[PDB]
Short mmCIF file of C-alpha atoms in Angstrom, two decimals:
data_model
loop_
_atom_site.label_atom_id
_atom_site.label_comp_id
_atom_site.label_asym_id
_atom_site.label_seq_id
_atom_site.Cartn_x
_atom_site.Cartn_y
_atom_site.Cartn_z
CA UNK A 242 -13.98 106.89 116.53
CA UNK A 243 -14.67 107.95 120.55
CA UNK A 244 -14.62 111.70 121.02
CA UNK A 245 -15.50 112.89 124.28
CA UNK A 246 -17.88 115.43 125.01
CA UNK A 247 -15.81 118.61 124.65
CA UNK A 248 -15.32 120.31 128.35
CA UNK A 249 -13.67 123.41 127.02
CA UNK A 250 -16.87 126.23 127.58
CA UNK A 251 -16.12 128.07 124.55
CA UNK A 252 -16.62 125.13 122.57
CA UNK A 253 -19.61 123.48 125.47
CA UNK A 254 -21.54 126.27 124.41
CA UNK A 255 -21.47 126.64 120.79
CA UNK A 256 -23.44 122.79 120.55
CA UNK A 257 -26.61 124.24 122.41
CA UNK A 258 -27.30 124.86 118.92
CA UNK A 259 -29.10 122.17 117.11
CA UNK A 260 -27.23 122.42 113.91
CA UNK A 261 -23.89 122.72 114.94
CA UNK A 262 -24.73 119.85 117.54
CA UNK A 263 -25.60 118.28 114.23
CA UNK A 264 -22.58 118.36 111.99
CA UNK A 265 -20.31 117.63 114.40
CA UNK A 266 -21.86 114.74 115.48
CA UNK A 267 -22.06 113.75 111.37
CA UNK A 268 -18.09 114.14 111.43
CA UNK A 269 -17.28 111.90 113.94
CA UNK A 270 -14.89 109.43 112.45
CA UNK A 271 -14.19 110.46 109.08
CA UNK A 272 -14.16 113.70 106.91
CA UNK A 273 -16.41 115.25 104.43
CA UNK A 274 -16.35 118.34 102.62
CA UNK A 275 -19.27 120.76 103.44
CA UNK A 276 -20.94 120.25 100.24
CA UNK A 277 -21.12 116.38 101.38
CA UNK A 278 -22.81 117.60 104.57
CA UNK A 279 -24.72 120.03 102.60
CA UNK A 280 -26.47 116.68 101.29
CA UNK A 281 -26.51 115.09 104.33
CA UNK A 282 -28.24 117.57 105.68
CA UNK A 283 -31.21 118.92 102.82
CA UNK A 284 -33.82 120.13 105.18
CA UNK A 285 -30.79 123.16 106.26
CA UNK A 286 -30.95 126.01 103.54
CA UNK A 287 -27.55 125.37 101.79
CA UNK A 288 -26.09 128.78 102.81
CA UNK A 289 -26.44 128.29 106.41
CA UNK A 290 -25.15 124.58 106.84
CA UNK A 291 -21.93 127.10 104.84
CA UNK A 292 -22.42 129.77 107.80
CA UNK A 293 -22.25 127.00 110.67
CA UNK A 294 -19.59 125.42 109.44
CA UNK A 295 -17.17 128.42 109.19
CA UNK A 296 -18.25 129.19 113.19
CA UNK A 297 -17.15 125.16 113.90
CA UNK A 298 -14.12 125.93 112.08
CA UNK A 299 -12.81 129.18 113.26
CA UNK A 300 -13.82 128.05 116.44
CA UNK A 301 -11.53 124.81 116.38
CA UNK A 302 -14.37 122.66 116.89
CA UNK A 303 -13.28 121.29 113.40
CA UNK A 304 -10.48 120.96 111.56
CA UNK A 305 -9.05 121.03 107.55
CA UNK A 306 -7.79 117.91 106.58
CA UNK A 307 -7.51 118.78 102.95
CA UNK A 308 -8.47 121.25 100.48
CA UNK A 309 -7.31 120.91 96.75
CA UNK A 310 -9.28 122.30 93.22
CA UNK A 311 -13.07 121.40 92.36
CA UNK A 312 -14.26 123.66 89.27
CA UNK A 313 -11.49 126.22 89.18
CA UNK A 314 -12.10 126.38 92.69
CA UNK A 315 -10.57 125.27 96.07
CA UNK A 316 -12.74 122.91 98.84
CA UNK A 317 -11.48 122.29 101.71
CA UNK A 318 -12.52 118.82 104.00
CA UNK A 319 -13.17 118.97 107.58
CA UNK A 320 -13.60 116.56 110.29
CA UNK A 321 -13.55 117.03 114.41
CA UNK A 322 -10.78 118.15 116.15
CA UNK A 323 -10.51 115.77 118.59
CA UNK A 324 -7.95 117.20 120.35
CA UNK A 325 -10.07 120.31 121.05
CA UNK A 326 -12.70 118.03 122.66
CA UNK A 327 -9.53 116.35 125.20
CA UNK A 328 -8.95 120.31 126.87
CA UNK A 329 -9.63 121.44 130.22
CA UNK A 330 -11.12 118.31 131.63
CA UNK A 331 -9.71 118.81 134.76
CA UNK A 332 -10.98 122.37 136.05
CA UNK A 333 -14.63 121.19 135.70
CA UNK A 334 -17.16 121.51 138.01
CA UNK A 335 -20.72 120.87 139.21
CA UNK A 336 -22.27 123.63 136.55
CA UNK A 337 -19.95 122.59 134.12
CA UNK A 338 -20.80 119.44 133.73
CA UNK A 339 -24.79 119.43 133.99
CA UNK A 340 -24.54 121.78 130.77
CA UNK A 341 -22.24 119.24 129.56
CA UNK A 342 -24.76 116.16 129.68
CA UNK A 343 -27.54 118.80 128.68
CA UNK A 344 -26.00 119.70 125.89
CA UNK A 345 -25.14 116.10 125.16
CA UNK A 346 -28.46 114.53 125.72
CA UNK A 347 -29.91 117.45 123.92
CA UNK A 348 -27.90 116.10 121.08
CA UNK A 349 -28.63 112.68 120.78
CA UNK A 350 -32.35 113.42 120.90
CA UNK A 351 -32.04 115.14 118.01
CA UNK A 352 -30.56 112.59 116.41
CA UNK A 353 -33.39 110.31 117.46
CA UNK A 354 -35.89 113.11 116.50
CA UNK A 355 -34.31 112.63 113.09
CA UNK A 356 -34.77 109.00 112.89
CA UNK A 357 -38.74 109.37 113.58
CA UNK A 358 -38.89 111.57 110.79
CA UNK A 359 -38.28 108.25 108.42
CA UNK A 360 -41.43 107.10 106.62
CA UNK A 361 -41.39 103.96 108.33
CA UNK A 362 -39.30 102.78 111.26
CA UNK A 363 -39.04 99.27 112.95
CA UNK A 364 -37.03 100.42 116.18
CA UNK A 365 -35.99 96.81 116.98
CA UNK A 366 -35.33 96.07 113.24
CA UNK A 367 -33.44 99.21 113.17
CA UNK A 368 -31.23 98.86 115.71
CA UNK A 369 -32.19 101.59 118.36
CA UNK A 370 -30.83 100.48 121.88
CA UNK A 371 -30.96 101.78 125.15
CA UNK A 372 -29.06 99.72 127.66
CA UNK A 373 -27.12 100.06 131.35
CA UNK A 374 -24.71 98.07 133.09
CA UNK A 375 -23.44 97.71 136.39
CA UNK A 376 -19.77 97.43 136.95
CA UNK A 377 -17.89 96.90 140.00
CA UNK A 378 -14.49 98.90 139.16
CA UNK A 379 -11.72 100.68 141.23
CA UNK A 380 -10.41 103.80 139.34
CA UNK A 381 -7.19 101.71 137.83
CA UNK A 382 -9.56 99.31 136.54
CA UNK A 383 -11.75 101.44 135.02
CA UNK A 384 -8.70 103.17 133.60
CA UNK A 385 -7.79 99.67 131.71
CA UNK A 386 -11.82 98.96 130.89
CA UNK A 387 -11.90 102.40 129.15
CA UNK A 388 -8.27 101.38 127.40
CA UNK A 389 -10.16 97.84 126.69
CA UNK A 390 -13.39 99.18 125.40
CA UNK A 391 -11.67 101.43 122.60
CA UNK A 392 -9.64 98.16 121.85
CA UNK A 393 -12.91 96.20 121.43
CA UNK A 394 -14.10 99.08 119.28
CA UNK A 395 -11.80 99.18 116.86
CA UNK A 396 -12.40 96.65 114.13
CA UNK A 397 -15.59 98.11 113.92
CA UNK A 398 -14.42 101.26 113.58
CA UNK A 399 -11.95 100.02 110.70
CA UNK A 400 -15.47 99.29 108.76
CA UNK A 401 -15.70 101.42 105.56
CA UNK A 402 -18.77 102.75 104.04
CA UNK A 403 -20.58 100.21 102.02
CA UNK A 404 -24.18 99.74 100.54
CA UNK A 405 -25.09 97.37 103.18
CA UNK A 406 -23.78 99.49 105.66
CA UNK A 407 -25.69 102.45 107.83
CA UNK A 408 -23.68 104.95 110.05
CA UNK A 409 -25.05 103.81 113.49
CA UNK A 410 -23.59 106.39 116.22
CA UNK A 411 -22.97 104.76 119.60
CA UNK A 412 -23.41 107.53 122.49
CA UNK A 413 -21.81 106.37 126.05
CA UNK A 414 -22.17 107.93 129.58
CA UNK A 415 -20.67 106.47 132.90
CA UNK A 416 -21.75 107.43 136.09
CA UNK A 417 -20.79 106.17 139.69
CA UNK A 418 -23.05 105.63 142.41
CA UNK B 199 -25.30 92.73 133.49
CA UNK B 200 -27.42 94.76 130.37
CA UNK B 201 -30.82 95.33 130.52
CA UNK B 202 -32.58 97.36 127.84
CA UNK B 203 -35.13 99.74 128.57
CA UNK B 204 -38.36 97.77 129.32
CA UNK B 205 -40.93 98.21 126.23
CA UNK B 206 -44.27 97.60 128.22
CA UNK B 207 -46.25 100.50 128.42
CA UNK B 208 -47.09 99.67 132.10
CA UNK B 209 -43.67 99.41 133.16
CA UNK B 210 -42.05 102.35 130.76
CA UNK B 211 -44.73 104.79 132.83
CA UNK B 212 -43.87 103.66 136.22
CA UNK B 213 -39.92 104.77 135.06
CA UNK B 214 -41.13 108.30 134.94
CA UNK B 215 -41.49 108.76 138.99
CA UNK B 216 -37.87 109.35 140.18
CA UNK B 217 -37.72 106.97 143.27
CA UNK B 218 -38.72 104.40 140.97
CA UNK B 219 -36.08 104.94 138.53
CA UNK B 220 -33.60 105.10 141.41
CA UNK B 221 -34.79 101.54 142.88
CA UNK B 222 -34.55 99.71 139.69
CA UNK B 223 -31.04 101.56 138.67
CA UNK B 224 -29.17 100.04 141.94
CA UNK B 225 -30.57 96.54 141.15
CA UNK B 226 -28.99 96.26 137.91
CA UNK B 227 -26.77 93.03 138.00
CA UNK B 228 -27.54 92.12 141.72
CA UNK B 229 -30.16 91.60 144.20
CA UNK B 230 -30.44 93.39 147.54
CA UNK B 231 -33.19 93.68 150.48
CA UNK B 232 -35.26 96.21 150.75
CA UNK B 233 -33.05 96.68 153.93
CA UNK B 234 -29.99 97.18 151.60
CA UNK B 235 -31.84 98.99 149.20
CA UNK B 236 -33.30 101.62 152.07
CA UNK B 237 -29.60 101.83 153.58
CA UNK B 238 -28.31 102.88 149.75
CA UNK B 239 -30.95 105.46 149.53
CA UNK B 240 -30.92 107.70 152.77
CA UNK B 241 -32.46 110.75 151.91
CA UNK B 242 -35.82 108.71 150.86
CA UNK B 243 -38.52 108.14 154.01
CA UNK B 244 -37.73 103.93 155.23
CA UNK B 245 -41.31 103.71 154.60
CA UNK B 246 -41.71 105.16 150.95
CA UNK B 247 -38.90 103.34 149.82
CA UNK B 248 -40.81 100.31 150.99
CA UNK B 249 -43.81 100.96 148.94
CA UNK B 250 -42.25 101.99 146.01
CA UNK B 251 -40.34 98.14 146.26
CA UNK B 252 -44.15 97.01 146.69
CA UNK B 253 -45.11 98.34 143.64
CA UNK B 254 -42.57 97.71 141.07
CA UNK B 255 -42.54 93.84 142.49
CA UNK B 256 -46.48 94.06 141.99
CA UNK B 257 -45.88 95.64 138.54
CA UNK B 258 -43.25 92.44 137.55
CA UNK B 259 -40.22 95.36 137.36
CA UNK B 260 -38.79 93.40 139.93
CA UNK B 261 -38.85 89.96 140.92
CA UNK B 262 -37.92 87.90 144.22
CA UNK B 263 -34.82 86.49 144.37
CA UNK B 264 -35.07 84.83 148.16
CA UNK B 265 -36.56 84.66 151.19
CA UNK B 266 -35.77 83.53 154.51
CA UNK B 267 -36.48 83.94 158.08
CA UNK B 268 -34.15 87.27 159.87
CA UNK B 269 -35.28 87.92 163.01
CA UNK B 270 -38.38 86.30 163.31
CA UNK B 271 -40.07 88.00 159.82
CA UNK B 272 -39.54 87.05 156.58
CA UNK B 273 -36.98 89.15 154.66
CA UNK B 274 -37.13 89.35 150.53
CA UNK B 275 -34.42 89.46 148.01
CA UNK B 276 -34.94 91.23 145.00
CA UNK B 277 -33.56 91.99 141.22
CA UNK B 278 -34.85 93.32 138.27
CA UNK B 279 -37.12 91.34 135.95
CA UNK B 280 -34.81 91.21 132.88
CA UNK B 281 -37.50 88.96 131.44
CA UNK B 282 -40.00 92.05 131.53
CA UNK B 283 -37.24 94.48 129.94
CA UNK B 284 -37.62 92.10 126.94
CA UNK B 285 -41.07 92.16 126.29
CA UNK B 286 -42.55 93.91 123.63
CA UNK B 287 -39.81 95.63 121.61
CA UNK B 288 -41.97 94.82 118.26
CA UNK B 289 -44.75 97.26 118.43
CA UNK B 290 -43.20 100.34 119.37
CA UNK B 291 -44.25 103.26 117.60
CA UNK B 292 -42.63 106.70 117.10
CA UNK B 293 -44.50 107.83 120.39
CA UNK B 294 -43.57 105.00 122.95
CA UNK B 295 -40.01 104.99 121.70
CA UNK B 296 -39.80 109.54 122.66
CA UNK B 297 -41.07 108.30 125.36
CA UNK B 298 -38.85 105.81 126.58
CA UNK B 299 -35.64 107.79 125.34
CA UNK B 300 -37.22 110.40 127.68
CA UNK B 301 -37.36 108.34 130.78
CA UNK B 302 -34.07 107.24 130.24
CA UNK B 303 -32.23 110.07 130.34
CA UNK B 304 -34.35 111.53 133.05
CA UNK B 305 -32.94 108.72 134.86
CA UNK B 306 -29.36 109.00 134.02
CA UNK B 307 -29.91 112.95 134.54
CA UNK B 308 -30.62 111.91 138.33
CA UNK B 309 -27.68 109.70 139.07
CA UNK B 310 -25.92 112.16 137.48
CA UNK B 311 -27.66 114.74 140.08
CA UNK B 312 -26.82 112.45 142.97
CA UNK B 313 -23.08 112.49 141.90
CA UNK B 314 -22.85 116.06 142.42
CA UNK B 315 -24.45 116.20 145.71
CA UNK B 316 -20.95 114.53 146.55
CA UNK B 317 -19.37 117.24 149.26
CA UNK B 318 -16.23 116.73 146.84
CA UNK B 319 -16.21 116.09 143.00
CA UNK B 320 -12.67 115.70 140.33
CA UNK B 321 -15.18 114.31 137.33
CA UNK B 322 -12.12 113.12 135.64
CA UNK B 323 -10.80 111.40 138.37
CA UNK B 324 -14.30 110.26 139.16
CA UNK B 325 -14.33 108.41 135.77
CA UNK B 326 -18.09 110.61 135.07
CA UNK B 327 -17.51 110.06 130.97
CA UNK B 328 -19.87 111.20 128.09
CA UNK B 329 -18.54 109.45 124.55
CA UNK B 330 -19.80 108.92 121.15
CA UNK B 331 -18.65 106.46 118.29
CA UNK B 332 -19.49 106.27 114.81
CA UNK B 333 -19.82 102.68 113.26
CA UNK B 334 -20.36 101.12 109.57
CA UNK B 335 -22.72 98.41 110.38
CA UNK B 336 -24.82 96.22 107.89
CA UNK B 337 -27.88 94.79 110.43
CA UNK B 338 -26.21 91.63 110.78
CA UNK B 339 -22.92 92.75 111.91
CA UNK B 340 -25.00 94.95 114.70
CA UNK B 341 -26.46 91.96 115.63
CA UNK B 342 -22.94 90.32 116.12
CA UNK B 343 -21.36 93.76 117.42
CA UNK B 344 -23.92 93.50 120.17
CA UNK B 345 -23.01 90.12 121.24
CA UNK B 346 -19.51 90.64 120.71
CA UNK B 347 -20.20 93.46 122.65
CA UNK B 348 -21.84 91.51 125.87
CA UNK B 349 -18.96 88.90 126.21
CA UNK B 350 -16.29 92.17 125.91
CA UNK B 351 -18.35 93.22 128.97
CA UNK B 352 -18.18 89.67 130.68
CA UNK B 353 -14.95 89.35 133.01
CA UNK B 354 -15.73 92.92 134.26
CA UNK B 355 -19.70 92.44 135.02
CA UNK B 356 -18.28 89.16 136.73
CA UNK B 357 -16.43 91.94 139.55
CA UNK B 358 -17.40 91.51 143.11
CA UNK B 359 -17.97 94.00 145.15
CA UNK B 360 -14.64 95.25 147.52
CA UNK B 361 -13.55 98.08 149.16
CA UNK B 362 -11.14 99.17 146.49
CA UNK B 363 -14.12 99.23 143.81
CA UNK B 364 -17.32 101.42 143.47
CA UNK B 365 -20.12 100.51 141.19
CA UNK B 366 -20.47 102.25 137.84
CA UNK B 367 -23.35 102.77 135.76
CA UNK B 368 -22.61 102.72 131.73
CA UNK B 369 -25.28 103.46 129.70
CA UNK B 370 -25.19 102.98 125.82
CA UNK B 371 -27.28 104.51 123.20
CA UNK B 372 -27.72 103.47 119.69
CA UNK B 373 -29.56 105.42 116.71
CA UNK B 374 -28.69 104.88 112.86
CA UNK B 375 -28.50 107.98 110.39
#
């Protein structure tokens, strides 16, 4: 499900850090509970994917979606607050929004960084893209494309979890000349 | 109209140089003179703008679209080479594919640069958006999500230029968990 880069700067800078870049971008369009990204994530010493968490949460990066009794003991699930990442769009400027795309593009490498640690990778095979387009739009149309694209998107997005299935995260970025 | 990042490691290092970039960037999904092209890109010497046309046409980036007679001299049209952005997508290895990811946000990095040189910027109005979605994909349904995806694209690729439209760039990213 499309979240947008966050533009709020409380929550801008808190994803300079590779972890927290991390989970949130592993919580984009469903929920898990941390153990779940505990094992998503087994390189991260369990305590501190824990730690990192807690700073997403009680800084409304995330959000509880549930929490009910496992072992005697209550979990709670947690998955992106998008409407955190939909605040204070407006007021941004020039150095605002270069540590926005840093931070962004920072992330995403990661992500690829991640995929090159598999034992063996087929890039085309595994569906790695980089593409660009050129679109002639006025800002009304590009208002209905973006209302267009999500409606495009969202079969896709309906698709549950399955073993034939991998995550694949789509990252967009639209520029004018 | 999408082009992938070319594969060839000839034409993947001549994307590093920033002028270069630039060049093949405005050609995406038309063809201009290196008239045009000069006119689009003020800030770069007439004559360096004309070699770095030279050698990307040399190189098979781009490719000539037309010539005819304008003025007495002959006068070249050119576009990119989507052919050459296809080639050799099989062999890349953990290194050429950093590599390319590099370039390619280096380039996007710079357009995004050039959009804040503007004496005025409203990002939001602008339509400057960085978005991510997470998708449940076997493969095979990539394969047809990316299709699907180029004839969503269609009707607005087929806009003309007018003076109620500017150009936008959208660039798409895709890595698997």
């Amino acid at each position: 499900t499309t979240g947008q880069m966050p533009a709020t700067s409380s929550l801008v800078d808190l994803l300079h850090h590779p972890l927290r870049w991390r989970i949130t971008q592993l919580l984009i369009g469903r929920s898990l509970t941390t153990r779940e990204l505990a094992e998503l994530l087994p390189d991260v010493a369990t305590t501190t994917l824990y730690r990192q968490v807690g700073i997403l949460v009680k800084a409304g990066v995330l959000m509880v979606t549930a929490e009910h009794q496992v072992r005697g003991a209550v979990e709670r699930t947690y998955t992106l607050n998008t409407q955190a990442g939909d605040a204070d769009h407006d007021g941004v400027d020039a150095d605002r929004l270069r540590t926005m795309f840093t931070v962004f593009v920072a992330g995403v490498g990661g992500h690829l960084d991640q995929y090159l640690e598999r034992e063996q990778i087929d890039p085309l095979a595994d569906g790695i893209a980089f593409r660009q387009t050129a679109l002639n739009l006025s800002d009304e149309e590009l208002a209905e494309f973006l209302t267009a694209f999500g409606e495009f998107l969202a079969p896709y997005v309906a698709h549950s979890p399955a073993p034939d299935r991998t995550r694949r995260v789509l990252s967009t970025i639209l520029i004018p000349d």
